Ligand binder design. Sequence first.
Ligand SMILES: COc1cc(OC)c(/C=C/S(=O)(=O)Cc2ccc(OC)c(NCC(=O)O)c2)c(OC)c1
Length: 82
Amino acid sequence: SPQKPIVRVFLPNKQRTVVPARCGVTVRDSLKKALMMRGLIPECCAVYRIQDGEKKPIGWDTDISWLTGEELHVEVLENVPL
Ligand SMILES: COc1cc(OC)c(/C=C/S(=O)(=O)Cc2ccc(OC)c(NCC(=O)O)c2)c(OC)c1
């Protein structure tokens, strides 16, 4: 059934957006909107999601429709954060 699923991304500065689980869409497209909805840009950010007290670094080329229902984190790449 054509349901509208969503995945919420925590933007930089501890904000949070929500994007539909865009099928055939990479993180970059979906969450570049996410940045722009805060007024930010996808250039200076990285995308990785916090799991069990840990971090699972996602790829900007990752298909976002697999990350549905799961909240992501976008963290500013300042001086290459590990
Ligand atoms: C900060 O930048 C953004 C922040 C947003 O939010 C904080 C939204 C979007 C909010 S939203 O409410 O439209 C998400 C959304 C979509 C579909 C849903 O069901 C199908 C539901 N269901 C739960 C509910 O209705 O609350 C929620 C944003 O969108 C581009 C950008």
